[PDB]
Every structure is written in C-alpha cells, then in structure tokens.
C-alpha cells in the first residue's frame with residue numbers, strides 16, 4: 001500500500017520526536033522537522049504535507065497552521081496530517097490518517113447543521129490508534145486555535161467498537177428484555193448510522209441554549225458540569241429523534257435507542273475508581289428518571305416506562321430553567337445551582353469534593369468488569 | 371468443607387438481602403436477618419455468628435456490634451463475620467472470611483506498634499473476593515465506630531497478586547537494570563513478607579507527625595491531600611528501612627525495594643481516565659525526585675541515583691515543615707500549602723480543578739495497558 005509507506009515514514013519521524021514535546025513550538029526544532037517532512041520520499045509529495053511544511057517554516061512570525069487547516073476544512077482530500085498537542089489525547093504528536101465520510105440524512109444535515117465530520121478511520125499513524133482518541137478538534141493542532149467554522153472529526157468506528165464491546169453486553173445484563181428492539185442484533189452498518197446521527201445532533205446542540213460552548217466553556221469544566229453539558233445535548237438529541245417529524249421514523253427511533261442506551265449504560269460506568277464526568281451525569285440521569293417515573297427497577301433490571309419521553313422533556317426543561325438565569329445572575333451563581341441539582345441525584349462526598357459510583361452501577365462494574 | 375458449607379450459607383443469605391441496604395439498620399429487617407443466621411445449619415453454630423446474632427437483635431437500643439468486635443479484636447479464632455457498610459468497599463454486605471497470620475519481626479512489632487493485622491485470606495464470601503477490597507477497617511461494620519485499639523486487617527495476598535500482575539512488568543519495562551535486585555524473581559512468600567512490613571510501617575506512621583489521622587482525617591480527603599498523606603507515611607517507612615539498624619538487614623532492604631517500586635510504579639499509574647489520589651501523589655514524588663537529583667531518566671528508563679536516600683529525607687522534611695505550621699496557622703491554611711506544593715510537581719488543570727496523568731506515565735499506561 002502507498003498510504004502504508006506514507007504512514008511508516010510518519011511513524012518513524014513520530015518516534016524520533018517523542019521526548020521533544022517541550023520544543024514543539026521552538027523554531028529550531030520546527031525547521032528540522034519541516035525539512036525531514038519535505039525530504040520524506042512518499043510523505044513529502046503529499047499536498048497536505050507541503051501545507052504543513054509551509055506552516056511550520058513560518059511559525060516564528062505566524063504561529064498558526066493555516067495552510068493545513070485550509071486543506072482539511074475544504075476537504076481537498078480525505079487525509080489529515082499535522083503536529084498535535086492535546087492534553088487529553090496525550091498519544092498524539094506528529095500524526096497522519098485517512099478517513100471515509102458517512103451517508104447523511106439531508107434534513108438532519110440542513111436543520112441541525114454544524115461543522116461536524118463523523119468519519120471512519122481507514123489508516124492511521126500510531127497516535128491515532130489509541131482507544132482514548134475518539135475525536136479530533138481544531139485546537140488540538142499545536143497552534144491551539146478553534147474557529148467556529150473549523151471542521152470537527154468524530155471517529156465513528158471507535159464508537160461502534162465501544163458499543164459492541166460494552167453497550168451490547170450491558171443491554172443484555174441490565175435492561176428488561178425488549179428494551180431496545182431496533183438495536184438487538186443490529187450490524188455494524190446500523191450502529192454506524194445511529195452513532196453518526198448522535199454526533200451530528202450532539203455538536204449542534206452544544207452551540208444552542210443560554211450557555212452554549214465554547215462561549216461558556218470555562219464555567220463547564222468542573223467534572224459534574226462537563227458531564228451535565230454532555231448530557232444536556234444528548235437529551236436534546238433524544239427529543240429531536242422523538243419529536244421532529246421530518247426525520248425518517250425508523251432511522252430516528254434507532255438513533256434514539258442508541259443515545260439512550262449509551263447514556264443509561266456505557267457512560268454510566270466510565271471511570272475507575274471514581275466516575276468520570278460522563279458517568280456522574282449519567283448517574284444523575286439514572287436517579288432522576290427513577291425518582292420521577294421515567295424508568296423503574298424490578299429486581300435490578302431497568303424498565304423504560306411508556307412515560308419516559310415526558311420525563312426526558314421535564315429533565316431538559318429543568319436544566320434549561322437553571323441555565324436561563326444567566327440573564328439575571330452570574331455564571332458563578334448558575335454553576336452552584338447546576339451543582340446543587342447534580343448533587344441531589346448523585347453520590348457526592350463533600351469532604352473529598354468528588355463523586356462515588358452510585359451502588360447500582362458499582363455492582364454492575366463488579367459483575368461485568370466494565 | 372465445614373467452612374465451605376458455612377460460606378455457602380453466607381453467600382446465599384447475602385444474595386437474599388442484596389437490594390436491602392436501605393434497611394440494614396431497621397430492626398424489623400435485623401430481627402429477620404438474625405433469625406436466618408441463627409437457623410443456618412452450619413453458619414448459625416459458629417461462635418462469631420452467635421455474637422453477630424446477639425448484636426443485631428439488640429441493635430435498636432445499642433447500635434453497636436460490640437460482641438462481634440470483641441471476638442475479632444481478641445482473636446478468639448481466625449474467622450471474621452459481620453454486616454458491613456463501607457462506601458468505598460461497596461461489594462461488602464453480609465460477609466465471612468477466614469484468615470491466616472504472618473511471621474512478624476519482633477523489633478518491628480515493638481518499636482512500630484499498631485493494631486495492624488497483615489493477613490492472608492484463606493476462604494471468603496463473595497463480597498470479600500472483589501479486588502477493590504484490600505483491607506478491612508473497624509468503621510466498615512454497620513455501626514460505623516472505630517477505636518484506637520481496634521484491629522485493622524490488610525489482605526497481603528491481594529497485594530502479592532497486584533505486585534505480580536502490575537509492578538513486576540513495570541519494573542522490567544520502566545526501571546534501569548539492577549534497580550531492584552532483591553525483588554527480581556523473588557517468590558510470593560518473599561513479596562508477602564516485604565508487603566507485611568510495608569503495611570505495619572504504613573499504619574504506624576499514619577498516627578505520627580503534626581497532623582495524624584484520624585484526628586486530622588477530614589482535612590486530608592481532597593484527592594491530592596489523601597494521596598499525599600499515603601505518600602508521607604510510605605516515605606517514612608522507606609526511610610525506616612534504610613535507617614533503623616535494629617531491623618534485619620536483608621528483610622529491611624527487601625521492604626525498601628517493595629515500598630519504593632510500588633510508589634514509583636504501580637501507584638503512579640492508578641486511575642482511568644484521571645489519576646486517583648495515590649497516583650497524583652506518586653507523580654508528585656516522581657517529578658520532585660527528578661528535579662532534585664534523586665532519580666534520572668536515561669533512555670526512557672528510571673535510574674535510582676546513589677543520592678536518593680538524601681533526596682527522600684529532603685522530601686519528607688519538606689512535607690513535615692508544611693504540616694508543622696498547624697501549630698501557628700489554621701488547618702485550612704496548611705491544606706492550601708500542601709496543595710500548592712503538590713501542584714508544583716503534578717499536572718493540575720485549574721479550570722477542571724482536577725489532575726491529568728503526567729505524560730511520562732500516560733505513555734506507560736498506553737504501552738503496557740496499566
């Protein structure tokens with residue numbers, strides 16, 4: 001494979017520059033990196049690689065990767081290649097991948113438009129092979145810039161893999177039989193479709209509401225708040241799938257099943273020893289739905305109530321009433337009221353100032369090794 | 371086995387009361403539990419089970435498990451049986467185990483005396499089989515009480531298993547050759563003895579210094595501070611192994627290697643996606659030692675410097691100077707100075723108010739799957 005020989009060159013340069021992360025913005029390093037890229041027999045020929053060489057050589061006066069991102073954002077081809085510095089994707093340094101796009105419902109694409117690119121990774125350098133790396137954001141490039149129209153990638157194949165390895169097992173063990181009938185025995189192409197719908201709705205709704213991100217990003221980074229924000233947009237996504245009549249009914253219900261099953265199960269068990277931000281918000285959802293009649297527990301198995309759509313609407317309405325007070329109070333006051341809401345429905349240790357997995361999911365973690 | 375039949379009866383009773391934790395102190399529930407225990411053909415005739423039945427039947431007027439704890443503390447036999455509620459050991463409800471005691475050095479038990487019981491679990495009910503449950507504390511019983519002379523159990527067999535599963539392959543991959551010569555190929559009984567020394571020195575030092583626990587426990591539960599407290603007592607134990615000449619020199623050096631390798635390696639990688647309390651403090655140690663001449667990184671491998679004992683002393687002295695100010699400043703002010711120290715040497719995200727694995731150990735987690 002030619003792409004395979006390109007990636008081998010990237011992987012080899014990546015190996016040499018590991019341990020040089022502190023000089024990734026030093027111009028002496030960058031000139032040598034650029035020269036090594038340009039002199040690479042297969043990689044140096046690539047248009048995206050010429051864009052990076054030009055960007056890197058100019059960095060001392062323009063610390064931006066403008067040529068690379070122009071190439072990527074215009075989809076001049078299906079290759080991504082750059083120098084990355086993402087604190088939460090530590091595996092990424094000099095990296096290369098090729099992707100394939102997914103079929104898109106046209107109403108979805110127009111009414112809920114965002115710069116989202118749900119894609120499958122076809123081939124990639126080693127950093128992109130880490131299971132941690134599920135997406136790629138514009139500020140992950142060394143320049144750290146994000147503009148509102150930069151493309152954001154989500155790697156759907158990694159979400160299909162997680163759903164196969166964790167969510168299916170959890171559906172069988174934790175849900176009442178018949179709970180997610182469209183997802184039962186679905187093939188990868190079908191989960192791929194739902195997951196792509198999920199990410200499209202997800203990104204769109206992050207930018208909606210009274211405290212959208214990135215505008216209010218620095219108020220939504222505390223663990224319970226970062227998770228609550230993910231949950232806000234995913235419940236918004238569930239409700240769109242339930243209520244927007246211009247979406248094909250069978251595809252919309254499948255996407256609904258996917259978002260609900262991921263949030264009620266896979267995300268609810270993330271993090272060892274303590275829940276991560278997603279798990280805290282999923283356990284908030286779990287306890288809120290149990291207490292307000294959206295789900296029932298019968299012998300430790302979850303029943304989805306017929307009334308669940310109304311209880312989801314009530315839950316999103318409640319988040320929105322808290323966020324709406326941004327117009328009459330401070331962001332810091334809204335934060336405390338989001339924390340108070342969260343802590344009513346989660347296992348918050350006030351001395352540690354952190355969270356424990358609620359007993360229902362602690363036992364599932366023990367029983368299934370998730 | 372008769373004990374096999376006793377444990378089978380406990381596991382079945384545990385199964386019936388799962389999902390009744392909200393009732394574990396309701397006398398109607400306790401009366402019924404007590405009757406089922408007393409009627410168990412094998413379990414009900416055990417002396418410790420006689421004791422539990424008696425404590426549970428009296429719980430409405432005396433919410434204590436005094437008879438059970440008298441049996442256990444007096445070591446009337448090597449069986450433990452009770453009703454537990456420990457939020458960090460969620461698998462424990464009604465549980466039974468038998469243990470065996472370990473050889474003990476006389477000087478160690480006299481000079482560094484504490485109610486520590488380093489033991490091996492021989493047989494146990496299901497709750498005690500979780501890898502989370504590494505110890506048993508007196509306040510873990512449903513009465514929530516701990517007294518200074520109550521026995522505290524550490525399950526050394528689980529620390530041997532963790533050493534062989536994680537620490538050993540980390541030593542091979544991350545330490546310069548010859549770093550831990552006494553541990554190389556050491557058998558399980560040898561690691562057992564080193565671990566039992568670790569726990570004895572550990573519990574002893576928790577009770578020494580200017581902010582001992584449990585007196586100052588509620589000030590040391592924030593993630594970085596709970597880790598730093600575990601690290602304070604383990605550095606103290608390392609130094610005792612190096613410095614106290616009345617300890618047998620072979621066993622002392624072996625314990626030193628065990629404590630250092632555990633804190634430099636196994637504890638340094640704990641927690642996904644973020645470091646737990648132990649890992650934050652271990653990363654503090656790693657960066658402190660790197661910056662102050664106690665270890666060096668050559669080829670991505672850790673070299674223990676000959677000067678390391680002096681740098682460990684400097685590190686413990688530093689902690690002790692921060693804690694000593696409890697005599698002239700508030701406990702809250704000491705907390706802020708312990709945090710400030712920690713954050714100088716770890717990857718602290720001030721907007722999330724949490725920690726990320728430093729890149730050195732993030733790469734090891736990816737490489738070795740730990």
Ligand SMILES: CC[C@H](C)[C@H](N)C(=O)O
Pocket residue numbers: 134135152154199202203206230
């Ligand atoms: C695919 C979702 C990713 C990880 C992130 N939650 C986002 O909003 O892009």
Ligand SMILES: CC[C@H](C)[C@H](N)C(=O)O
Pocket residue numbers: 504505522524569572573576600
């Ligand atoms: C075995 C040690 C346990 C986990 C705890 N750190 C203690 O000091 O009791």
Ligand SMILES: [Fe+2]
Pocket residue numbers: 202206230
């Ligand atoms: Fe998101």
Ligand SMILES: [Fe+2]
Pocket residue numbers: 572576600
């Ligand atoms: Fe401890």
